Write a protein that binds this ligand. Sequence first.
Ligand SMILES: CC(C)(C)[C@@H]1NC(=O)O[C@@H]2CCC[C@H]2OC/C=C/C(F)(F)c2nc3ccccc3nc2O[C@@H]2C[C@@H](C(=O)N[C@]3(C(=O)NS(=O)(=O)C4(C)CC4)C[C@H]3C(F)F)N(C2)C1=O
Ligand SMILES: [Zn+2]
Length: 202
Amino acid sequence: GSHMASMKKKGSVVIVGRINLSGDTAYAQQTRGEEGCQETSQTGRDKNQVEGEVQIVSTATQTFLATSINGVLWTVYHGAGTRTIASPKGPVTQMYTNVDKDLVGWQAPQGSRSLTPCTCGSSDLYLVTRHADVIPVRRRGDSRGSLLSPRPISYLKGSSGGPLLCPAGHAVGIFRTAVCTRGVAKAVEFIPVESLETTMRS
Ligand SMILES: CC(C)(C)[C@@H]1NC(=O)O[C@@H]2CCC[C@H]2OC/C=C/C(F)(F)c2nc3ccccc3nc2O[C@@H]2C[C@@H](C(=O)N[C@]3(C(=O)NS(=O)(=O)C4(C)CC4)C[C@H]3C(F)F)N(C2)C1=O
Ligand SMILES: [Zn+2]
């Protein structure tokens, strides 16, 4: 538009829940409902206590995941764009933005726990979805893995920004893309942790 005084502002990304990997069972928890999410997106002020490594996040129009690795909460550019994230003191600006990697990052929220970047060189991986499904994935390239059990894409939708982990629970990558045939996801692509570690200068 040409009328700046009425131009709107996009809201912040908001943490609305988490994937609980604390104990012996993985399960999703919601920490904020739709109304509070909308309000928090507009104000950027989120006083809710944050816990864990994998957050469920939402904008006004999308919901996906975000994962803390080495003190950074990482997600996909196609979900977050350039948006701030809501936090107790107001909106927090991205610390990393790389559209070429489909990647953004913010400082990890107080109370979150961070995954350690994997140095195992292991190719037996585990994708964690927004429904707390743990999906075996065989690493097939620097940024590619095949699902041991293919699944309709509906089962993976909304899980971009989630982790692929190694057998020891280290972060190997950030889920960003599915490779499908006739609506069935047979493979995934991810941002490898080394591409993050480069981004971080670790
Ligand atoms: C057909 C398909 C499966 C929808 C699509 N596959 C696909 O295109 O495969 C091609 C062929 C082989 C590799 C790949 O090359 C293109 C790479 C695309 C990309 F990913 F790098 C990407 N870079 C962007 C950068 C800037 C702006 C937009 C961008 N948009 C992109 O891709 C778009 C987004 C991505 C997506 O849906 N991700 C997931 C997800 O859950 N999102 S989400 O949470 O629901 C949500 C949309 C709320 C945020 C994990 C997959 C879940 F559904 F399984 N896409 C399309 C796909 O996966
Ligand atoms: Zn490892």
